[PDB]
């Protein structure tokens with residue numbers, strides 16, 4: 573069987589949807605952990621060196637010049653577009669605020685379901701290239717998975733239609749909602765823009781508190797992969813309740829609602845729309 577390594581649980585889950593029984597799949601970043609900065613364990617280094625295919629997000633999630641995945645593949649003498657593949661290739665890239673330069677991308681493309689489809693098609697193409705005798709399975713599974721994601725994307729495009737503009741604001745700890753905000757017409761705000769920044773100074777909390785006095789949503793949200801303390805402080809100081817945990821940089825643990833890319837996005841759409849409509 574093809575040996576496949578994925579950098580995190582979101583990419584690994586998309587790969588499972590395409591490949592099912594046919595591959596030997598290893599996922600590096602544990603569920604619930606930050607995928608931006610991680611220290612691979614010896615088993616991760618071994619599996620990466622022995623893999624036939626390595627999938628990573630790209631666009632400044634784990635692949636900055638000094639970032640953990642770049643070091644891993646360079647130490648292993650692996651080559652981009654031969655051994656390892658950025659599943660985000662082909663998306664319309666959004667950058668960090670005020671930026672336009674390579675290396676300053678916003679990585680969170682998968683929160684737009686159109687980009688989840690792009691990721692999945694890229695995964696399927698590279699699995700078919702390296703394991704052509706399972707093409708029938710990969711293509712069949714891809715076609716059904718894409719159809720399912722497209723139906724959810726159509727739902728997402730009208731999910732927030734009944735909510736007034738003066739309370740359409742998704743508030744999370746990390747500024748990970750740019751692609752969702754652009755695709756689905758719901759602006760977003762944050763404590764820290766990206767996880768490599770300082771995660772929750774009193775000044776960052778104060779900046780968000782001041783923003784929430786201008787546009788005041790009925791709910792805040794907190795991601796499954798961050799320390800909740802900063803958002804608990806935002807909630808206490810603003811009086812706006814945390815409505816639900818949501819899934820941004822990780823799927824949920826197995827058996828918990830949201831334990832796949834599809835299920836985490838359905839969860840996010842339901843919980844965010846329900847909380848904002850209060």
Ligand SMILES: [Zn+2]
Nearest residue numbers: 746748767821
């Ligand atoms: Zn993130």
